[PDB]
Design a protein around this ligand. Structure first.
Ligand SMILES: NC(=[NH2+])NCCC[C@H](N)C(=O)O
Length: 241
């Protein structure tokens, strides 16, 4: 049905009483569609909690990962929460909040397969488009072929099928996919290639909303709500530092 695109200040959002949140929905357990086809995950629970702390009704918009930061700047939504690591290149285009979790990227292979970056010379490596995983693979240039996917779970499918040697993805995403599919004797998590701080994003220059999100996040972190949502999803506290 389309929508009115606008980069909205915090007070413009408050007048409307609803906050528009962009996410992907193909990155379990952070943001994904469940078995009854409803949007859920750690970041959805956290997004909802942020909206509530700002006195706002959340309206969720799911779309392809590579589109998110473009449509944010175009005004499709007010903020994005979809597991973006903070990087210098992205910060040119969007403003990041303080990070809502810390993580890193790992090499995942079948048992006996490549464990570390130096082992990827001559191999086929699968990554999601526009990710810090793709960037890491582009920095391991002895790779025979970097196969890039629109959706991260498709790279995993190709790993299991033998079409790639190695999948580079989030450490929590890899751990859960292995538990979830009972792959403990099939796949092998190797080197932590890099660490990253993961944050919400607002349109470039949208400082009023940026400040309001940071205030809400700090409030969730002090009032136990963040700790509760992190326990629910991970059985541990996943906050930075
Ligand atoms: N919703 C998603 N599929 N997100 C992928 C994010 C992956 C990685 N943390 C990055 O910053 O690029």
């Amino acid at each position: 049905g389309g929508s009115e695109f606008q980069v909205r200040s915090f007070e413009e959002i408050k007048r409307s009483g609803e906050i528009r949140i962009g996410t992907e929905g193909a990155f379990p357990p952070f943001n994904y569609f469940d078995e009854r086809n409803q949007l859920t995950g750690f970041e959805v629970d956290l997004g909802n909690a942020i909206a509530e702390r700002l006195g706002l009704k959340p309206r969720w918009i799911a779309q392809s990962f590579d589109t998110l930061l473009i449509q944010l700047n175009q005004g499709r939504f007010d903020f994005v929460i979809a597991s973006h690591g903070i990087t210098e290149e992205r910060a040119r285009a969007v403003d990041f909040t303080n990070p809502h979790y810390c993580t890193g990227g790992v090499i995942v292979s079948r048992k006996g397969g490549p464990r570390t970056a130096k082992d990827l010379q001559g191999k086929v490596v699968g990554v999601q488009v526009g990710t810090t995983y793709m960037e890491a693979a582009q920095k391991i240039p002895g790779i025979k072929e970097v196969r890039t996917y629109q959706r991260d779970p498709d790279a995993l499918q190709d790993l299991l099928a033998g079409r790639i040697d190695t999948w580079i993805t989030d450490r929590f995403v890899a751990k859960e996919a292995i538990k979830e599919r009972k792959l403990e004797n099939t796949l092998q998590v190797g080197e932590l290639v890099f660490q990253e701080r993961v944050a919400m994003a607002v349109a470039k220059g949208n400082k009023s909303l940026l400040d309001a999100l940071n205030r809400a996040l700090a409030e969730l972190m002090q009032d136990g709500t963040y700790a509760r949502i992190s326990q629910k999803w991970f059985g541990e506290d996943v906050r930075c530092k």
